[PDB]
Amino acid sequence: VPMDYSWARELGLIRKPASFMTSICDERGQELIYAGMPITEVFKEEMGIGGVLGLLWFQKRLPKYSCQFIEMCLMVTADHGPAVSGAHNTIICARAGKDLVSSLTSGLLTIGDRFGGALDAAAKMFSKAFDSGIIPMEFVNKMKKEGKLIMGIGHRVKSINNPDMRVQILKDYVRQHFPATPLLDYALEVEKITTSKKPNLILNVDGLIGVAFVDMLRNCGSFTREEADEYIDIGALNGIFVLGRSMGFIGHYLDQKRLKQGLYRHPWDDISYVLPEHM
Amino acid sequence: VPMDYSWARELGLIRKPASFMTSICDERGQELIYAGMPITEVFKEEMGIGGVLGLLWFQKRLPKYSCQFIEMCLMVTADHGPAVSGAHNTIICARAGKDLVSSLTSGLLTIGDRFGGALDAAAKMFSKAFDSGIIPMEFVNKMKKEGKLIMGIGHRVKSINNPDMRVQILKDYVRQHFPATPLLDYALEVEKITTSKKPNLILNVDGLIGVAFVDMLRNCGSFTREEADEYIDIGALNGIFVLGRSMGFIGHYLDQKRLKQGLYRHPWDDISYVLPEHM
Amino acid sequence: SAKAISEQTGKELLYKFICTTSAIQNRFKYARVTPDTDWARLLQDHPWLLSQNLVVKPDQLIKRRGKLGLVGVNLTLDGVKSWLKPRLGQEATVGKATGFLKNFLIEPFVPHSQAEEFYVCIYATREGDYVLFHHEGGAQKLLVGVDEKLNPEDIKKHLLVHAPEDKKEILASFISGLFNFYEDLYFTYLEINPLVVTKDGVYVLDLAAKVDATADYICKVKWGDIEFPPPFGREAYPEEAYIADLDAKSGASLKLTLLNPKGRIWTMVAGGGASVVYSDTICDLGGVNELANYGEYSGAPSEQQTYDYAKTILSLMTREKHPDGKILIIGGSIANFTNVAATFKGIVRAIRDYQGPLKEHEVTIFVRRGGPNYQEGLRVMGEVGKTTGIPIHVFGTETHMTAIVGMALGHRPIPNQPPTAGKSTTLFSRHTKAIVWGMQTRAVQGMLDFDYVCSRDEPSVAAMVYPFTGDHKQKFYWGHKEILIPVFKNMADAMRKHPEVDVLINFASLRSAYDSTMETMNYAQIRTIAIIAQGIPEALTRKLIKKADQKGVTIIGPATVGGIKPGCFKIGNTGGMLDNILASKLYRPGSVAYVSRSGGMSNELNNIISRTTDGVYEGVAIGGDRYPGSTFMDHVLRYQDTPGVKMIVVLGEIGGTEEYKICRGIKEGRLTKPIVCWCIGTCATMFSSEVQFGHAGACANQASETAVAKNQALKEAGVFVPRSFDELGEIIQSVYEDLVANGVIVPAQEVPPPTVPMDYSWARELGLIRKPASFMTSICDERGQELIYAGMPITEVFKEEMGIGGVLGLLWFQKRLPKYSCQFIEMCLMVTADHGPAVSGAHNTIICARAGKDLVSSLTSGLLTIGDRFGGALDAAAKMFSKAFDSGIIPMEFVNKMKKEGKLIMGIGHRVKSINNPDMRVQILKDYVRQHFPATPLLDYALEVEKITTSKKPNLILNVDGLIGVAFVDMLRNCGSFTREEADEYIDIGALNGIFVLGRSMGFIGHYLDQKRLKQGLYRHPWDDISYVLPEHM
Amino acid sequence: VPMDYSWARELGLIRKPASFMTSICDERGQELIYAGMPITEVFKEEMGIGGVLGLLWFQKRLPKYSCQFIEMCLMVTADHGPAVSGAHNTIICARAGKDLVSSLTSGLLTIGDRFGGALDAAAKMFSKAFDSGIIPMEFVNKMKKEGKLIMGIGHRVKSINNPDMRVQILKDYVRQHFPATPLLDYALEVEKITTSKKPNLILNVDGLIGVAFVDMLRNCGSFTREEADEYIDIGALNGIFVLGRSMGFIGHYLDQKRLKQGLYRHPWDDISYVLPEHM
Ligand SMILES: CC(C)(COP(=O)(O)OP(=O)(O)OC[C@H]1O[C@@H](n2cnc3c(N)ncnc32)[C@H](O)[C@@H]1OP(=O)(O)O)[C@@H](O)C(=O)NCCC(=O)NCCS
Ligand SMILES: Nc1ncnc2c1ncn2[C@@H]1O[C@H](COP(=O)(O)OP(=O)(O)O)[C@@H](O)[C@H]1O
Ligand SMILES: O=C(O)C[C@](O)(CC(=O)OP(=O)(O)O)C(=O)O
C-alpha cells in the first residue's frame, strides 16, 4: 500500500506548496494568537475591540488613543435609523422570516458607493488633494470646474451655529489625543470655504471619520506612509462603516422579530409602471 | 532534498484522501461532462435548460416532457412585479449603485419561508397528506383543527369562473403530457373542497408547481420513490423558484440601471418610531 | 453694494497695489489716532513723526473737513498734541448728523502751491467708468467702457489738455496705474482731491473711495479684513456686524442697521423692499425718532439663520426699558419662495428664548405676513402669544400690508375678528419653453402647476441643467399625471436637444451666475434670461448688460424673482405657491401690466391689482441691483406697445434716475396709456445720516435720486401718484373705474381653472388625510436635532462612557445595561473575533477576496456560512443548557438524558485542550463572569455538567461557544434589566447568533484586508483533492 | 376625523409621488404581463426561457435565433466543475448546513472580477477595438504595448486540431443563424494572430459568448446601436454568466446534501502562517 501523505510530510520525504497565506491569527497552538500577540496578553494590557481591530486588520499594536478612536468611530456609524437603504433591506428580509445572517447580509450588501461609500470617498479625495499639494481654496475651485461635489462636505439640516453633534464628539477627541492632524486641519479649512457658500456645507461624520482615520494611520507611529496609504487603498475605511453599521443592522433584525412584523409587500400606488406597449 | 507531492502522487508512492466529492460535472478532460453526458451530446439530443437541469440537479436524463415542464416552471416563476419582497430589495440595491451580483443577491436572500416558500411547502404538505392515506376532505378538516392554512391554496384576486392563467397553462401541459398525476388529482380535489368555502381558495402557481413537480419526480420513471422523496426534502423546489426568480431579479437590476434611478431613502412618515422613553 | 471705505483703508490699498512707473511719495506715511491709544506706541511704530511737519484729519468719512476747521495744516508734533485736545473725542455737526470724533489720521505735510494740486476721480456708471481730471484742484471727463482698457495715449488727448508739458508723463502713468487699481480691487468710486505732483513725485493727499462689497469673494486676499465704517452720525454696533457676518455666508440676505438703539419701534420685516415700505409708513405716522432699526431678511433664509437674526433683535430691544412699552413689527409682504413656516419657527424659538425680558419691557408684537406655508407660520406665531404671555397680534394676506403700523402706533384700532383667518416686445407666450439652471425642483413644479391651471398644452420647463450630476430624467407632475423632464450635465446638450427653448431661468449662485449667463448667450435661441441670484458684483453685471445689448437678449435681473404673465408663463417662484396663484387669480390675464424693482412687493402688487382690477396682464420684477439687466423703460415701452395692456403700474425705489425716463417718455408722447407709480424710500429723507437699504441700488447719491423727489416729478408728468403706498390700491382702482366707465376696459367672463389635486405632504402636515405607517422601529431615531440610540441621545452615550457593548445594549436590547454587562459583551466580541483561516467562513472570505471582490462581498461570502455547523454552537449551547436548567433536572440527569437521545452536549468538548490543560479564552471570560456578575445560576449548572463529562474524557470541557452561551443567558437573566419572559425571547430570536456574527465579522474583514496586502491571486482548487463520482452515462 | 389616504387618492383629491419606476413586469392586472406580453401569449408563441429572458431584461421580442442562442449560452455556462472559486464556496456553505439560498449566494458572490468577469470584459474589449476602428493586427500589438492580455483569448489545454467543443457548438449556431457577425469575424481574426504565437491562444467560451452576444444585440434588429451599447455597459453579460452558473451552483448544493458531506475545515499544512513576531 502507498504511504500516507501525513506520514510522508511529517518525516520530510515530500513537500507540497501551501496554497494559502495568512497573517492575522494563529490558532494551531496552545493559545489563540492575534497578530503575534496571544489572547491572554490581549486582555492583560486591556486593549479593547479597537485594540484587536488594530491586530486583526493592521497587525499593529496601536496606541490607546488610536484604539479608543476606532471604537468611537464604530458607535457613531452604528446606526442611522431605518430609512437608509441598507437598514431598509435588513428590515424587509427580517420581515420575510429569514434568519439573522440572511437579514444582516441583505442590507449589508447595499453598502457600496452610494450608501456608506462617502466614508472611504472623503478619505481618498482629501488625501489626494493634500498630498498633491494645493491650498484648500484651490481644491474647492478644482472640484467645481470638473463638476464634482466634495465628498464628506454637506449636511442636510445641521448647518452652522447648529453643529452636528457626532462630528463635535469625534473632533474633540481627535484634537486632544492625536499628536498631529494635518489632513484634519486641511479639511477644516475646506469647510471654512464651503460654509461661506451655504451654511449646510460642513464636514460630515462621513468626512470627519475619513480624514481622521488617515491621520490616525500616518501620524500614530505604527505605520509607514506607504503602509498607511495601502490601507486607504484596499478599503480599511469601508470596513469601519461595515463593522459599525452591522451593529445597527443586527439591532434592526432583532427589532422586527420583537414586533412580529409580517411580510412586506410594497404598495402598487408607490410604483410607476411604464412598461412597453407590446414589446 | 524532499520529493514533490505531485511526483509522489502521480507515480504512486503516497496516498492522500480527497476532501471533496462531486457528481454533477466533470471538467478535467477533453469535453465538459454534465452528469456522465458530454456537452456535445447534450446539444445533439436537443435537451434544453430543463434538460441540463435534470443532469446537474438530479443526474438523470429526464424525458422530454419533464425537461419542458421544468422550463415552463421557470417562466411562470420568472417575475411577479417589483412589489414582492425580493424584487424590492434588488431595486434598492440597484439604486444604491451596486453591481449585478450584489443587487441580485440582496433580494435573492429574501427567498425563504414567507417569500418564495410556498413552492416547497405545498409540495411537502400535499405529499404528506397523500402518502398518509387520508382523503381530501379529511385533510382539509385536519388542517382546520391544527390551525394551519393549506399551503398552495388561495388567491386574492382570481378565484373561480375567473382562473389564474399561469395555473391553467401549467395544468394543461401536466394533463396531456404527464403519464400519471396522483398528487395533482389529490390537490385538485382539495381545491373542490376549499372552493365551497370561499371562491378564492384555488390552487396557486406556488401550489400547482409544488404538486406537479412531485408528480414529475415520482411518476416519470427516472426516480425511485425514496430518491424522489429526497429531492423534496433537500430543497429541489426551493431551487426552482430561486433559479426562476433570478431571471426577473436581474431584469429588475437592469431596469433600474436603464432608468438611472438614484439612491432610495424610505420616507419618515411611513415609519412608526416607537422608541423607549430613556432606556 | 457700494460701501464707502475710510481714507486710511483706501491709501493702504493704493500703496500696496498701484502700479506706477513713477514713484509714489509718502508711501505708508499714515498714523491712526484714537482717544484710546498710547503715544509711545505711535512714536515707536512710525519714526517719521518728529522729523517733519504734520497735518491731521478725522478719519470718520467726513467730507469737506477743511471748511469746518477740522484740518490742522502744517503742525509740528507738539502742535498736533495741542490741536486734538479740544477736538478728539467730542461732538461736531456736519450738515444734520452729529457724532463723536474718535479716529484721526496723521500724515506728513506736503510743500505745494495751487499750481501743484490736481483732482482725479474715477466713478462707475452703467455704461462704464468715468475718469475725471481737473487742473485747479482743491473738469475733464473720460468714459472708459465696460470691457475697455484705459491706455496712456488716451489720457493725454482728453484728460491732460490743461496739464503742463513736464507733468503729462507722470500723471498719465499714475492715472493708468490708478485706473487698473480701481478695476482689480473692484472700486465703484475713487476720488483724490487734491493730488499733488511736484518734482519729488506723486503725493496722494486725500482719498475718498467706495468698493463694491459684494465682490468680497473675488478680492478677499487683496482687501484683507477690510472694514467699512458707518457714516458720520451713527456708531458701529457689534450686533450689526454679527448680522453682516451671517449675510456674507449664504445667498440669503440678512441686513441690520441700528438707527436709534433707545427707540421703541423695532422692525423685523421680510424683504428688502417690503421693509422700506414699512419704514416709510412708520416715518409717515410720526415715528421717525422712535424707529429703532432698519433691517430685513430675505432670499429664503433658513430656520437657523432667522433664529440668529431674531435673537439679535430681541436681545437689542430688551436692553433698557421704555415707559410706554416697545413695539416689534414682524411684517412683510406675500413671499414668493421664502418658506414662512420655517421662517416663523425660527422667530418663535427666539421669542421663547427671550420671553423673560420681553414681559419686562412691555413688548407688543404685530405680525402681518403671507407666503409659502404661511398658515403654519401664523399658527405657531399665535400659539407663542398665549403660552408666553406676550401680546402677539397675528394677521395675514387679508389684512393690508402697512395696517399693522397704524395699529401699533395707535392711529387705527385692532379688529378682533380677522385674526385667525433689438429687444422684443412679447417675451412670453403660451408656447414659451424654458430651461432651468439648477436643482430647483419646487420652483419647476410651481411653473408646472401654473401651466396646468393656465390650461397650457405643454409645460414651461423643457430641460434642466445641473453640472454636478449625469444626464437623467426627473419625475414631475402635469396636474395629476406624472411626466419626466430631462436633466442635463451640459448646457450644450440641453440647447441642442431642445431648440424650441427661448428662455433660460438661471438659479446659479452669485459666484456662478456670471459664467452661466455668459455661456448661455453663445446660444442664439435664448432671447430672455432671468438671473435669480443676489450679490453679483456690479462690475460683473455690467458685462452681462453689455453682451445682452449686443446679442439682443432681454435680461430680467439679477436679484429678482422673475416675473409672471398670467395665462402664458411665470418665471421660477414668481407669485408663490398655487394657493396664491388662485387667490390673486393669476391663471387668466387682466388689463394691468406692472413693472417693479422688488420681487416680494410684486407679489403684493399681484394682490392689490387682483382685488381692485380684473387682474394682471404681465408683471416683471427687475431686481434690486444697482444696474438691472432691464430697466423700467425696457418694460414700460413693451407694455405701451402691447394691446392687451390698458394701464401700467410702476413700483420704483430710491436711488437711480430710472423713473425720470418715464417722465421724459410721456412728454415726448411715447407713453400714452395711464401710468400709476409710487417710489418707495420716502423715509430716507427723514433720517439723520444716510442709510443703505437691503437692495444694492437703494442709495440716493444725488437729490434727484430720492424717492420723495421722484414721486413729486412724476406728478407733473401726468402719472397718477398716491400720497403713500397704503393708498396705491385706491388709485389703481380709481384709474380702473374710469377705464371701465369710458369703455376702454371690458372685463372678460370668469372661467374656472383646471384644478389640481392637493399635495400629499401638504395634506398630511395639516391633518386632512391619514395613512398607516407600514414600518415600525425602536432602536434608533434620526429625524431629530440629535441622533438617538433607543431613547438615549448620541452625546449622552459618549458622556456616560458606555462603549461598544453599551451601544449594543441600546441597539439590540433597548436597555441601559450595567457596566459589567457592557464590558462582558465586548469581551465576547474579542474572543469570537477570529479563529484562523481554516474555518469554513474564513475560508470563503479568503476565496472571495482572492477573486478580486470588494470588502462587502468577501465578508458576506464567508458570513453566510455562519449558521448551524459553523458558529451555531454559541446559540445552541445556550438554548440547550437553559432548557435543561429550567426543567429542574440535575446535571447528572441531563448528561444521561442526551446520551439516550443520541445527542452530544453543545458547548461541551474541545479537541485538544482539556482539564489540566485549560482553554485560555474560557478561563479569561469565566474569571470576568465570576468576579463581576451578581449571580450565575446557569454557569454553575454548566460547570457541574462539565465536571461529569470531564470524568468520561478529560477532553470534554466547556467550549468558548458553551461558556459565552451559558453566561450571556446569565447576563440577560441577572443584570436586572430584563424580565425572564423578555430575556428568554432574546435567546429565542437569536441574540447569540448576532454575537458570533458581529465578533467574527471583525476577523473576516481582517482576512479580506490580509489577502489584499499579500496580493494573492485567484484560487482554484486542486483536482486531486476532489473525488469525482459522476454517473456512468445518466 | 381625517379621510383615508386610499380613499382620497381614489377620488383624486390628493397626489403623491411614486418613488419607484418599473418596466419589466405588470402583476396587478387580470394576467401577468412580461414587458407588454401577457403570460398566455408568451406560451402561445412558443418563446422559451430565452424568449422571456429578452422580455424581462431587454423588453423586446427577440427573434427565435436570438432566443435560442441565449438559451445555449446558459447551457454552456451552466457548470464548470467544483474546483472553480464560486462552486467551491457553494460546496463549503452547503457542507456547513446552510440552506439553498445561502449556499448559492456564498458562491454567487465570487463572480465578477477574476471568476466569471471575463465574459463582460471580452465583450467590452473587442467592441472598443472594433468601434475605434483598427485592424486586428493593430489590436494584438496595442494590447502588448500596454501590457494587457486580451480577455477572451487563451485556453489552458485546447488549441488547434483539438478545439474547445463548447466554442465549436456556439460558433456553428452563430454562423448559421445570425444574419451578420461583424465582431465575431473580428475576434476570429484576432484569434488567427494569437494562435500564430502560441497554439493555445484561442477564443474562449468566455470570449465567444462575449462577442456573439454583442453581435446578437447590435445585429438582430430589435436594438438601436445606442441601446445595445448600454446593455453591455450596465452588465447584461454579467447576468448571462450568473443566471447560467446558478444552475450548476444549485446542482452543487443539492449534490452535497445527497452525499451528506460533513463540515469542511481546511488543512493547516495547506495554509502558510506568516504572522508578525509580537506586533
Ligand atoms: C441663488 C439661489 C437660487 C441658489 O443659491 P444656493 O442654493 O445657495 O446655491 P447652490 O446650491 O448653487 O450652492 C452654493 C455653492 O455650494 C456648492 N456646493 C453644494 N454642495 C456642495 C458640496 N457637497 N461640496 C462642495 N460644494 C458644494 C455649490 O457647488 C455652489 O457653488 P457655487 O456657489 O460656487 O456655484 C439662492 O441662493 C437664492 O435664493 N438666492 C437669493 C435669491 C434672491 O434673493 N433673489 C431675489 C429674490 S426676490
Ligand atoms: N497731506 C497734506 N499735506 C499738506 N496739506 C494738506 C494735506 N492734506 C490736506 N491738505 C490741505 O487741505 C486743504 C484742502 O482740504 P481738504 O482736506 O481737501 O478738504 P476735504 O475735507 O474736502 O477733503 C488743501 O489746501 C491742502 O493744503
Ligand atoms: O418675503 C418677502 O416679502 C420677499 C422675499 O422673502 C424675498 C425678496 O424677494 O426680497 P425683495 O422683495 O425685497 O426684493 C420673497 O421670498 O419673495
PDB file of C-alpha atoms in Angstrom, chain A residues 19-25 27 29-30 32 34 39 43 47-49 52 56-57 59 71-72 74-76 78-82 88 91-92 95 100-101 104-105 108-109 111 144 147-149 158 160-162 165-166 169 195-197 199 230-231 234-235 239 242-243 247-248 250-256 258-259 261 264, chain C residues 242 248-250 304 308 467-468 489 511-512 774-780 782 785 787 789 794-795 798 802-804 807 811-814 826-827 829-831 833-837 843 846-847 850 855-856 859-860 863 866 913 917 921 924 986 989-990 994 997-998 1002-1003 1005-1011 1013-1016 1019:
ATOM      1  CA  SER A  19      -1.855  27.373  -1.330  1.00  0.00           C
ATOM      2  CA  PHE A  20      -2.865  29.930   1.323  1.00  0.00           C
ATOM      3  CA  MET A  21      -1.116  32.652   3.284  1.00  0.00           C
ATOM      4  CA  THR A  22      -2.447  34.282   6.433  1.00  0.00           C
ATOM      5  CA  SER A  23      -1.123  36.849   8.868  1.00  0.00           C
ATOM      6  CA  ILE A  24      -3.861  37.948  11.228  1.00  0.00           C
ATOM      7  CA  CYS A  25      -4.393  34.967  13.516  1.00  0.00           C
ATOM      8  CA  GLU A  27      -4.791  29.138  16.145  1.00  0.00           C
ATOM      9  CA  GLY A  29      -1.037  26.309  19.053  1.00  0.00           C
ATOM     10  CA  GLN A  30      -1.631  26.069  22.790  1.00  0.00           C
ATOM     11  CA  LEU A  32      -5.009  31.734  20.211  1.00  0.00           C
ATOM     12  CA  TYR A  34      -3.911  37.759  17.291  1.00  0.00           C
ATOM     13  CA  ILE A  39      -5.216  36.039  23.582  1.00  0.00           C
ATOM     14  CA  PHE A  43      -6.726  41.095  27.772  1.00  0.00           C
ATOM     15  CA  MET A  47      -6.747  46.776  24.541  1.00  0.00           C
ATOM     16  CA  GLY A  48     -10.368  46.764  23.543  1.00  0.00           C
ATOM     17  CA  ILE A  49     -12.336  45.978  20.423  1.00  0.00           C
ATOM     18  CA  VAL A  52      -7.966  43.816  18.495  1.00  0.00           C
ATOM     19  CA  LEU A  56      -6.548  41.719  13.048  1.00  0.00           C
ATOM     20  CA  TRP A  57      -6.751  44.405  10.368  1.00  0.00           C
ATOM     21  CA  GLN A  59      -1.120  43.587  12.521  1.00  0.00           C
ATOM     22  CA  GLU A  71     -14.214  52.228  18.984  1.00  0.00           C
ATOM     23  CA  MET A  72     -15.563  55.804  18.971  1.00  0.00           C
ATOM     24  CA  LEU A  74     -17.906  52.279  15.476  1.00  0.00           C
ATOM     25  CA  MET A  75     -20.509  53.842  17.803  1.00  0.00           C
ATOM     26  CA  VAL A  76     -21.239  56.847  15.588  1.00  0.00           C
ATOM     27  CA  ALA A  78     -23.539  52.041  14.441  1.00  0.00           C
ATOM     28  CA  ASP A  79     -26.979  53.059  13.209  1.00  0.00           C
ATOM     29  CA  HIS A  80     -28.702  55.925  11.439  1.00  0.00           C
ATOM     30  CA  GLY A  81     -32.311  54.812  11.578  1.00  0.00           C
ATOM     31  CA  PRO A  82     -34.428  52.501   9.429  1.00  0.00           C
ATOM     32  CA  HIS A  88     -34.446  49.101   4.817  1.00  0.00           C
ATOM     33  CA  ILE A  91     -35.971  45.007   7.743  1.00  0.00           C
ATOM     34  CA  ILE A  92     -37.592  43.592   4.575  1.00  0.00           C
ATOM     35  CA  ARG A  95     -39.995  40.563   7.985  1.00  0.00           C
ATOM     36  CA  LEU A 100     -30.124  36.822  11.313  1.00  0.00           C
ATOM     37  CA  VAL A 101     -27.333  36.114   8.854  1.00  0.00           C
ATOM     38  CA  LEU A 104     -27.974  41.279   8.031  1.00  0.00           C
ATOM     39  CA  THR A 105     -26.341  40.409   4.709  1.00  0.00           C
ATOM     40  CA  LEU A 108     -25.124  44.750   4.347  1.00  0.00           C
ATOM     41  CA  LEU A 109     -24.638  44.332   0.573  1.00  0.00           C
ATOM     42  CA  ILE A 111     -23.175  49.257   1.441  1.00  0.00           C
ATOM     43  CA  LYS A 144     -16.128  72.837  -9.059  1.00  0.00           C
ATOM     44  CA  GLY A 147     -18.297  69.054 -11.824  1.00  0.00           C
ATOM     45  CA  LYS A 148     -17.619  67.002  -8.691  1.00  0.00           C
ATOM     46  CA  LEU A 149     -19.095  67.720  -5.289  1.00  0.00           C
ATOM     47  CA  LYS A 158     -27.374  70.529  10.749  1.00  0.00           C
ATOM     48  CA  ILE A 160     -23.599  76.094  11.403  1.00  0.00           C
ATOM     49  CA  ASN A 161     -24.438  77.659  14.728  1.00  0.00           C
ATOM     50  CA  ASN A 162     -26.156  74.227  14.824  1.00  0.00           C
ATOM     51  CA  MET A 165     -23.061  66.527  17.435  1.00  0.00           C
ATOM     52  CA  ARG A 166     -21.463  63.297  16.213  1.00  0.00           C
ATOM     53  CA  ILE A 169     -17.799  64.451  19.713  1.00  0.00           C
ATOM     54  CA  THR A 195     -19.625  77.362   4.689  1.00  0.00           C
ATOM     55  CA  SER A 196     -19.148  80.765   3.068  1.00  0.00           C
ATOM     56  CA  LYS A 197     -21.343  79.461   0.223  1.00  0.00           C
ATOM     57  CA  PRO A 199     -24.221  77.159   5.907  1.00  0.00           C
ATOM     58  CA  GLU A 230      -2.201  50.993   1.298  1.00  0.00           C
ATOM     59  CA  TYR A 231      -4.965  50.622   3.890  1.00  0.00           C
ATOM     60  CA  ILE A 234      -7.524  48.449  -0.130  1.00  0.00           C
ATOM     61  CA  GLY A 235     -10.503  49.736   1.839  1.00  0.00           C
ATOM     62  CA  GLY A 239     -14.694  48.029   6.909  1.00  0.00           C
ATOM     63  CA  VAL A 242     -19.446  47.869   7.552  1.00  0.00           C
ATOM     64  CA  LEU A 243     -18.437  46.651  11.021  1.00  0.00           C
ATOM     65  CA  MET A 247     -24.373  46.506  14.832  1.00  0.00           C
ATOM     66  CA  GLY A 248     -27.435  48.572  13.981  1.00  0.00           C
ATOM     67  CA  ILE A 250     -28.488  43.233  13.707  1.00  0.00           C
ATOM     68  CA  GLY A 251     -30.389  45.502  16.085  1.00  0.00           C
ATOM     69  CA  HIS A 252     -32.782  46.177  13.208  1.00  0.00           C
ATOM     70  CA  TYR A 253     -33.148  42.437  12.612  1.00  0.00           C
ATOM     71  CA  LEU A 254     -33.875  41.678  16.264  1.00  0.00           C
ATOM     72  CA  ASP A 255     -36.328  44.589  16.423  1.00  0.00           C
ATOM     73  CA  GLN A 256     -38.593  43.232  13.688  1.00  0.00           C
ATOM     74  CA  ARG A 258     -39.841  41.607  18.689  1.00  0.00           C
ATOM     75  CA  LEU A 259     -42.714  43.385  16.970  1.00  0.00           C
ATOM     76  CA  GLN A 261     -43.983  42.265  11.766  1.00  0.00           C
ATOM     77  CA  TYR A 264     -43.870  43.331   3.461  1.00  0.00           C
TER      78      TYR A 264
ATOM     79  CA  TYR C 242     -22.768  89.870  13.662  1.00  0.00           C
ATOM     80  CA  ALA C 248     -21.981  87.105   3.615  1.00  0.00           C
ATOM     81  CA  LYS C 249     -22.068  83.328   4.211  1.00  0.00           C
ATOM     82  CA  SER C 250     -25.218  82.415   2.255  1.00  0.00           C
ATOM     83  CA  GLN C 304     -31.373  78.761  11.960  1.00  0.00           C
ATOM     84  CA  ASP C 308     -29.911  84.075  14.719  1.00  0.00           C
ATOM     85  CA  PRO C 467     -23.363  70.362 -13.885  1.00  0.00           C
ATOM     86  CA  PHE C 468     -22.798  68.139 -10.819  1.00  0.00           C
ATOM     87  CA  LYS C 489     -24.977  67.855 -17.192  1.00  0.00           C
ATOM     88  CA  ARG C 511     -20.390  83.245  -7.910  1.00  0.00           C
ATOM     89  CA  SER C 512     -21.836  81.074 -10.694  1.00  0.00           C
ATOM     90  CA  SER C 774     -46.122  50.318   7.134  1.00  0.00           C
ATOM     91  CA  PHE C 775     -42.984  50.096   9.301  1.00  0.00           C
ATOM     92  CA  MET C 776     -42.124  50.159  12.988  1.00  0.00           C
ATOM     93  CA  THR C 777     -38.774  50.816  14.623  1.00  0.00           C
ATOM     94  CA  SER C 778     -37.447  51.058  18.150  1.00  0.00           C
ATOM     95  CA  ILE C 779     -33.665  51.125  18.138  1.00  0.00           C
ATOM     96  CA  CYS C 780     -32.748  54.483  16.642  1.00  0.00           C
ATOM     97  CA  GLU C 782     -32.579  60.114  13.339  1.00  0.00           C
ATOM     98  CA  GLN C 785     -31.885  67.524  16.296  1.00  0.00           C
ATOM     99  CA  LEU C 787     -29.093  61.035  16.860  1.00  0.00           C
ATOM    100  CA  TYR C 789     -29.987  55.266  20.343  1.00  0.00           C
ATOM    101  CA  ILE C 794     -25.648  60.274  20.998  1.00  0.00           C
ATOM    102  CA  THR C 795     -23.937  62.806  23.278  1.00  0.00           C
ATOM    103  CA  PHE C 798     -20.344  59.220  24.993  1.00  0.00           C
ATOM    104  CA  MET C 802     -20.537  53.249  27.713  1.00  0.00           C
ATOM    105  CA  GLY C 803     -18.586  51.523  24.985  1.00  0.00           C
ATOM    106  CA  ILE C 804     -19.348  49.324  22.025  1.00  0.00           C
ATOM    107  CA  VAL C 807     -24.488  50.828  22.428  1.00  0.00           C
ATOM    108  CA  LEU C 811     -29.428  48.971  19.668  1.00  0.00           C
ATOM    109  CA  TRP C 812     -30.182  45.310  20.379  1.00  0.00           C
ATOM    110  CA  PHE C 813     -31.947  45.206  23.763  1.00  0.00           C
ATOM    111  CA  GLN C 814     -33.071  48.878  24.116  1.00  0.00           C
ATOM    112  CA  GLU C 826     -17.083  43.467  24.414  1.00  0.00           C
ATOM    113  CA  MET C 827     -15.044  40.542  25.758  1.00  0.00           C
ATOM    114  CA  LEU C 829     -16.694  40.098  20.665  1.00  0.00           C
ATOM    115  CA  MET C 830     -12.928  39.829  21.250  1.00  0.00           C
ATOM    116  CA  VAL C 831     -12.696  36.076  21.799  1.00  0.00           C
ATOM    117  CA  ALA C 833     -13.148  37.849  16.682  1.00  0.00           C
ATOM    118  CA  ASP C 834     -11.160  35.298  14.693  1.00  0.00           C
ATOM    119  CA  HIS C 835     -10.128  31.657  14.855  1.00  0.00           C
ATOM    120  CA  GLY C 836      -7.777  31.436  11.904  1.00  0.00           C
ATOM    121  CA  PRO C 837      -8.317  30.862   8.190  1.00  0.00           C
ATOM    122  CA  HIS C 843     -12.085  30.127   4.054  1.00  0.00           C
ATOM    123  CA  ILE C 846     -10.405  34.397   1.518  1.00  0.00           C
ATOM    124  CA  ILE C 847     -11.640  32.692  -1.679  1.00  0.00           C
ATOM    125  CA  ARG C 850      -8.693  36.329  -3.855  1.00  0.00           C
ATOM    126  CA  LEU C 855     -14.847  44.114   1.115  1.00  0.00           C
ATOM    127  CA  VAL C 856     -18.599  43.811   1.400  1.00  0.00           C
ATOM    128  CA  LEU C 859     -17.124  39.409   4.150  1.00  0.00           C
ATOM    129  CA  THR C 860     -20.654  38.352   3.178  1.00  0.00           C
ATOM    130  CA  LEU C 863     -20.560  35.447   6.757  1.00  0.00           C
ATOM    131  CA  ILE C 866     -22.465  31.122   9.814  1.00  0.00           C
ATOM    132  CA  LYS C 913      -7.435  21.393  25.327  1.00  0.00           C
ATOM    133  CA  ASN C 917      -4.753  21.960  30.006  1.00  0.00           C
ATOM    134  CA  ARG C 921     -10.380  32.101  26.288  1.00  0.00           C
ATOM    135  CA  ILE C 924     -10.394  34.713  30.761  1.00  0.00           C
ATOM    136  CA  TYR C 986     -33.666  37.271  23.038  1.00  0.00           C
ATOM    137  CA  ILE C 989     -34.849  35.250  18.320  1.00  0.00           C
ATOM    138  CA  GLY C 990     -31.078  34.831  18.120  1.00  0.00           C
ATOM    139  CA  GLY C 994     -25.578  38.147  16.420  1.00  0.00           C
ATOM    140  CA  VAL C 997     -21.596  37.256  13.573  1.00  0.00           C
ATOM    141  CA  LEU C 998     -20.589  40.696  14.856  1.00  0.00           C
ATOM    142  CA  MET C1002     -14.082  41.748  12.703  1.00  0.00           C
ATOM    143  CA  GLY C1003     -11.786  38.873  11.774  1.00  0.00           C
ATOM    144  CA  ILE C1005     -12.688  41.885   7.366  1.00  0.00           C
ATOM    145  CA  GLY C1006      -9.177  41.311   8.687  1.00  0.00           C
ATOM    146  CA  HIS C1007      -8.999  38.225   6.474  1.00  0.00           C
ATOM    147  CA  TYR C1008     -10.167  40.290   3.499  1.00  0.00           C
ATOM    148  CA  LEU C1009      -7.573  43.019   4.105  1.00  0.00           C
ATOM    149  CA  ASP C1010      -4.849  40.415   4.567  1.00  0.00           C
ATOM    150  CA  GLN C1011      -5.324  38.810   1.155  1.00  0.00           C
ATOM    151  CA  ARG C1013      -1.934  43.028   1.340  1.00  0.00           C
ATOM    152  CA  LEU C1014      -0.388  39.716   0.256  1.00  0.00           C
ATOM    153  CA  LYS C1015      -1.795  40.269  -3.284  1.00  0.00           C
ATOM    154  CA  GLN C1016      -2.960  36.678  -3.515  1.00  0.00           C
ATOM    155  CA  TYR C1019      -7.787  30.361  -6.026  1.00  0.00           C
TER     156      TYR C1019
END
